[PDB]
Design an enzyme around this catalytic site. Structure first.
Site, PDB file in Angstrom:
ATOM      1  CB  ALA A  40      -0.965   0.006   1.185  1.00 55.25           C
ATOM      2  CG  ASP A  41       4.807   1.213   1.816  1.00 52.46           C
ATOM      3  OD1 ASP A  41       4.676   0.270   1.005  1.00 52.46           O
ATOM      4  OD2 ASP A  41       5.731   1.272   2.650  1.00 52.46           O
ATOM      5  N   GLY A  42       3.523   1.830  -1.711  1.00 56.10           N
ATOM      6  CA  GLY A  42       4.284   2.000  -2.938  1.00 56.10           C
ATOM      7  C   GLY A  42       5.542   1.151  -3.069  1.00 56.10           C
TER       8      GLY A  42
END
Ligand SMILES: OC[C@H]1O[C@@H](O[C@H]2[C@H](O)[C@@H](O)[C@H](O[C@H]3[C@H](O)[C@@H](O)[C@H](O[C@H]4[C@H](O)[C@@H](O)[C@H](O[C@H]5[C@H](O)[C@@H](O)[C@H](O[C@H]6[C@H](O)[C@@H](O)[C@H](O)O[C@@H]6CO)O[C@@H]5CO)O[C@@H]4CO)O[C@@H]3CO)O[C@@H]2CO)[C@H](O)[C@@H](O)[C@@H]1O
Ligand SMILES: OC[C@H]1O[C@@H](O[C@H]2[C@H](O)[C@@H](O)[C@H](O[C@H]3[C@H](O)[C@@H](O)[C@H](O)O[C@@H]3CO)O[C@@H]2CO)[C@H](O)[C@@H](O)[C@@H]1O
Ligand SMILES: [Ca+2]
Length: 629
Positions: A453-455
């Site tokens: 989700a944080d890339g």
């Protein structure tokens, strides 16, 4: 005129190219040679960050070819070949033709066994064991008019950090050195770095020679070099693209094409068994091509006398799928501009293309990942293949070809490097054999890519194996290998591996139309650009789990043997890795590394590997060209 390229990804290639060529970043030496990594505290294959490798030069070629495609300027590509010929391909002073012309094609070398533990070396030469004949030397000397070999030696001490100098002078740079000499259990931490040109000026009484090979007489002053076949094959692959792209712009890299074609002609030495023994019948000396397995083996090596005139050449019995390059084989056997001058060059490469694709298929596991390889020399001594071991043209299956410390097929990197070449072949020709391999492999790997989700993201890092492939029968083909399985042990974020993976999936998606492959490729490229960019290219913090070996790895030295490294470090029984490389204590990162080891923590580093940075640059360019919209 070159076709339109996607501006976003082309700009990313251009930005990476600038960061890599930027003098202030330090990827290159004063002589214009790329280092393995900007950082010097570096041990993994080479054991010092500022050495260069034939692998790095072949990536330098690929990067420049791609820059020519977007800039219309190929002078950088021609310079990469000029630097390679000047510094990594032994000149006439490095492999004296007086010694090379004394080569006997009917007795290429003298047999010596390979051992499973470094403490069994030096290995004794035995003139009584059979050695087959070399059928290609006469084709090469006739075509090129010299007995010297045209192939890259694999590693170079660029700034003379070890102190051997050039041809035993101790002061010149760069310096031809070698490390690995003692079998499958000799990791990078267990070698004794030695000069390729040994006049006995450093090391022991007879230089470093008697640490590795034992002859009946007194050791002669001699030279020797070793090729890394996958590097020379990548040089041909990159040059073929430079030629295509240049022609699209009315430009020419003709002189470079000639060098690549000559390199591919000499590369045929990797097609042969180590001592030219018949493939599938290891006890018998070959009579020529019956000693050719037609695959890119672990190496071909050559050497000869400095003080007297004689020479030898050896191929390799061990084959790993990770080194194969069916794209280079297709270029050399079918493209008229890359046709080798020798009588049998193009045709031998046509045989290799077919043999390589069979090799990949035989090795494809139930899930899709490719297993290790095979060898024509069981235990490196032509021993009998144990019953029940499956085979490929008489060669026994080996899970981890050549090295066991660590296993050569436990690193995910080999999967992408090698499958990338299959994707290129598939893209250019639509070959059915390539499509069959890729459809299954790409389905396997697309299910192992994890985006957070944080890339950030993760891909397989370490892999393991169970079982073996079914014995290959060319008329029946792939059986599905239900008993050969791959297991992903852990994941990681190796940026070089992810860039190569993006490249492979991009070529495959452009040809097959597979959307999953295309979007996974783009998400990998975007994730890396957006979350791992830095002033020098891209990087991430990684754990250096084996670094404790700097201090605790004992290096084997035969009983009674004592010698000295150029800087005075004493080589004798008992020394650790750091003892014969004391200059490392001056490294800017040394204290940091040691402080972590002392506190019982795993040291970490943020590394800028030349091959990884070029890999990411090329992956962006490939995407810009194949998906312009
Ligand atoms: O009668 C005339 C005169 O003869 C002299 O005797 C000669 C004899 O004629 C000659 O045949 C003999 O040749 C042997 C060499 O002396 C010996 O050094 C050589 O060893 C090979 C070894 O077999 C092989 O296993 C080893 O492979 C290494 C390789 O070195 C290393 O570079 C490579 O590294 C790779 C990395 O593993 C990989 O990660 C990276 O990517 O790529 C690297 C490059 O591929 O790893 C491999 C595998 O571990 O290479 C060495 C060579 O360095 O074997 C020769 C054949 O048996 O020498 C004799 C003595 O010089 C008489 O002395 C004279 O009196 C007579 O007049
Ligand atoms: O010999 C094959 C190629 O190796 C490249 O180095 C890789 C190492 O072999 C690999 O062990 C390492 O991956 C480690 C990683 O550093 C660590 O953080 C993680 O915990 O475990 C991983 C698996 O052991 O990655 C490097 C870089 O890709 C050489 O760079 C290359 O020249 C050589 O051909
Ligand atoms: Ca070991």
């Amino acid at each position: 005129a070159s076709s339109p390229a996607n501006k976003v990804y082309q700009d990313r290639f251009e930005s990476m190219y600038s960061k890599i060529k930027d003098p202030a970043n330090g990827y290159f030496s004063e002589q214009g040679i790329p280092y393995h990594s900007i950082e010097t505290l570096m041990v993994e294959a080479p054991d010092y960050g500022h050495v260069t490798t034939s692998q790095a030069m072949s990536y330098y070629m690929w990067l420049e070819a791609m820059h020519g495609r977007f800039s219309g300027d190929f002078t950088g590509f021609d310079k990469s070949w000029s630097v390679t010929e000047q510094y990594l391909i032994p000149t006439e002073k490095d492999q004296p033709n007086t010694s090379m012309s004394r080569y006997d094609a009917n007795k290429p070398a003298t047999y010596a066994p390979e051992f499973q533990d470094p403490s069994k070396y030096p290995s004794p030469l035995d003139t009584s064991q059979p050695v087959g004949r070399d059928p290609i030397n006469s084709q090469l000397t006739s075509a090129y008019g010299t007995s010297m070999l045209y192939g890259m030696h694999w590693i170079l001490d660029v700034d003379n950090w070890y102190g051997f100098g050039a041809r035993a002078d101790g002061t010149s740079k760069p310096s031809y050195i070698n490390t690995f000499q003692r079998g499958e259990q000799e990791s990078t931490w267990e070698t004794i770095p030695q000069p390729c040109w040994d006049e006995h000026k450093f090391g022991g009484q007879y230089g470093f020679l008697d640490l590795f090979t034992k002859d009946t007489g007194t050791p002669a002053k001699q030279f020797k070099y070793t090729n890394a076949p996958d590097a020379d094959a990548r040089a041909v692959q990159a040059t073929y693209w430079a030629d295509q792209w240049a022609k699209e712009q009315g430009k020419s890299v003709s002189t470079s094409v000639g060098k690549a074609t000559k390199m591919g002609d000499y590369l045929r030495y990797s097609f042969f068994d180590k001592y030219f023994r018949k493939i599938g019948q290891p006890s018998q000396a070959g009579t020529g091509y019956d000693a050719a397995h037609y695959l890119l083996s672990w190496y071909y090596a050559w050497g000869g006398g400095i003080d007297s005139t004689w020479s030898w050449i050896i191929g390799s019995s061990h084959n790993h799928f990770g080194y194969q390059n069916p794209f280079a084989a297709w270029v050399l056997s079918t493209d008229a501009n890359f046709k080798p001058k020798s009588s049998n060059g193009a045709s031998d490469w046509a045989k290799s293309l077919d043999r390589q694709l069979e090799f990949y298929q035989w090795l494809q596991s139930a899930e899709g990942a490719i297993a290790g390889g095979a060898t024509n020399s069981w235990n490196g001594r032509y021993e009998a293949v144990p019953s029940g071991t499956s085979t490929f043209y008489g060669m026994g299956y080996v899970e981890n070809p050549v090295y066991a410390d660590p296993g050569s097929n436990t690193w995910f990197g080999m999967q992408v490097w090698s499958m990338q070449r299959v994707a290129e072949l598939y893209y250019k020709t639509g070959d059915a054999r390539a499509k069959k391999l890729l459809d299954k492999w790409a389905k396997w790997i697309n299910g192992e890519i994890k985006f957070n989700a944080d890339g950030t993201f993760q891909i397989p890092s370490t892999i393991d194996w169970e079982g073996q492939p079914d014995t290959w029968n060319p008329t029946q083909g792939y059986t599905g290998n239900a008993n050969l399985h791959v297991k992903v042990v852990n994941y990681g974020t190796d940026l070089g591996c992810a860039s190569s993976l993006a490249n492979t999936l991009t070529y495959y998606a452009a040809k097959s139309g597979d959307e999953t492959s295309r979007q996974n490729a783009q998400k990998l490229l975007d994730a890396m650009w957006n979350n791992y960019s830095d002033s020098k290219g891209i990087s991430t913090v990684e754990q250096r789990g084996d670094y404790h070996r700097f201090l605790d790895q004992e290096v084997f030295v035969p009983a009674g043997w004592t010698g000295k490294m150029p800087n005075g470090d004493v080589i004798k029984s008992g020394v650790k890795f750091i003892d014969i490389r004391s200059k490392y204590k001056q490294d800017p990162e040394w204290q940091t590394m040691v402080a972590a080891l002392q506190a019982g923590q795993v040291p970490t580093q943020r590394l800028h590997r030349f091959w990884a940075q070029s890999e990411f640059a090329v992956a962006n360019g490939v995407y810009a060209i194949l998906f312009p919209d």
